Design a protein around this ligand. Structure first.
Ligand SMILES: O=C(N[C@@H](C(=O)Nc1cncc2ccccc12)c1cccc(Cl)c1)[C@@H]1CC[C@H](C(=O)N2CCCC2)O1
Ligand SMILES: [Cl-]
Lengths: 305, 305
């Protein structure tokens, strides 16, 4: 019993964090095999930030300009290349702590663990979700650039995010491990803003099924809804449309609890209309959207209370 | 910017988790140097858990009855002893991954990271607080017994909790690493209940200072209060008394934000008497009490490990 926002154990990722210094800029790198991956903006000047020409800045750099530190050991850079917004530094030593890994690009609504680092030193781990507007609501300060997002399903680490910047609203933007940004963002200090954010409907439904599994049913009602009527209502509360894919994905939780997806959609419609009335669901007074259907099945029991 | 429930990096603790099997019972052990620590109830079956005389049950066991597995390697048990509610299994191999560590007993209100494990395999890390009623609101399933709670100070791991059981309300009970329970609990199947819980006042105040630091000031007012008048109000809402020690501990956050501790108490008083009025603080519609004043300073400063 119980339901917590749970992050993956960070040990396999801690053994990969290094510090990357270029001139006066220091940030974090991810050392996998003989390559260190970091944001390419590590080569920028405090002037260059508005309209940097990264190809022009990189051609002027030599291997010995990049200082890479793994703990108290200096790694030797023997090559460098740029792939989209990520810099790849070839080093002379393969990381002996390299876990089994994959690089995965995630879709909005997906969750992951963030190992927040400063100066190549891990300081904390938290769980978060890729928002529908492609931003993440993280907890990052100056020097956190290069910190990574990951999932550890079985013994393989799937790297899905690398932190690049903070937007004026306090939210964060970054890339996958191939250097492609999530969202319409660029690694430039030009006026950029996060689009209007919405609630991840499929995740709120999964969380309502987690509450039922943990023995709470106060919010259920005798009603059902069509998918179209549910979406007409959901849109008015800034909720993402629920697709037939989402309904299919909620199938296992629906079979376990005995509550049809469209009957759970009717409870959600009623919750959005009535509020909570001084009550909580899984210790929360708001509808939680940062637990996917997969997270609920992984964390919750296979037997409903 | 951002404020997340953040756990310590779990790597130093993951290298200590082992699986302990005794008869038909499997649970988690903590391997430090040549000793494996685990709940003593591992020596109890479904009949032995009703009225357990642990010395009588232990005297009947031999070293080869305890199966200890570290990854895919079987450790050899060469001795066994009991200290309070924890079993200490002497093994033939010192753990080469043993970090610098201390065993510490924490007080209610203090926070720690939990590395939840099943079959000696870490599955998740979350942050939580020792409630004033000595329970923890964790997330645990069958097989989680022996999972540990910890904090990190520089490079030293301070082990403060070992999971033993779940109470009928879904909350959890356990011991320090010397086998002394937190709270009036015993390790056996019998009628046990968590006492009435209270809110950790010093932690709510720290979280209000974290909200101010992150740009959330709607709840501030021009008013102040005496500690005596605040404690009368707090007692009416099931809030723990605020002592002069708590006021002294909030000193740094008070100096940084420019809001006196008793000035912040007048805000908390108005929030208790009038509510949030449809508004949120740090993305929450409830007053959050699982961040200590130290956690706030650490997360809003970037301390690394
Ligand atoms: O804000 C800065 N850097 C980036 C950034 O956004 N970093 C941060 C990330 N997360 C949380 C943060 C919280 C508070 C302050 C910063 C945070 C940034 C800005 C613009 C574009 C990009 Cl791609 C990256 C400052 C100012 C320029 C300096 C910097 O990155 N330099 C590169 C080389 C010459 C100096 O550091
Ligand atoms: Cl995905």
């Amino acid at each position: 019993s119980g339901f917590r926002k749970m992050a993956f154990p960070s040990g396999k990722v801690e053994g990969c964090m290094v510090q990357v210094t270029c001139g006066t800029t220091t940030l974090n790198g991810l050392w996998l095999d003989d390559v260190v991956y970091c944001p390419r903006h590590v080569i920028c000047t405090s002037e260059d930030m508005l309209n940097p020409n990264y190809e022009d800045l990189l051609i002027r750099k030599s291997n010995h300009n990049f200082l890479v530190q793994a703990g108290n050991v200096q790694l030797r850079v023997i090559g460098h290349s740029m792939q989209n917004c990520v810099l790849k530094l070839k080093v002379d030593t393969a990381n002996p702590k390299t876990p089994k890994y994959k690089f995965v690009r995630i879709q909005p609504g997906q969750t992951f663990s963030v190992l927040a680092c400063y100066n190549g030193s891990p300081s904390g781990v938290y769980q978060c979700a890729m928002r529908p507007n492609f931003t993440i609501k993280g907890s990052f300060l100056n020097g956190s650039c290069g910190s990574v997002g990951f999932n550890i399903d079985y013994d393989c680490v799937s790297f899905c995010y690398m932190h690049h910047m903070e937007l004026p609203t306090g939210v964060h933007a970054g890339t996958d491990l191939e250097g492609n940004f999530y969202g319409p963002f660029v690694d430039r200090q030009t006026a950029q803003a996060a689009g209007t954010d919405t609630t991840i409907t499929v995740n709120v439904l999964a969380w309502l099924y987690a509450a039922v599994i943990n023995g709470d049913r106060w919010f259920l009602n005798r009603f059902t809804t069509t998918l179209n009527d549910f979406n007409l209502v959901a849109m008015k509360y800034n909720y993402e449309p629920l697709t037939q894919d989402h309904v299919d994905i909620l199938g296992p939780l629906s079979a376990q609890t005995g509550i049809a997806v469209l009957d759970m959609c009717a409870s959600l419609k009623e919750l959005l209309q009535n509020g909570m009335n001084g009550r909580t669901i899984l210790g929360s007074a708001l509808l939680e959207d940062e637990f996917t259907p997969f997270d609920v099945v992984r964390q919750c029991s296979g037997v409903t209370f």
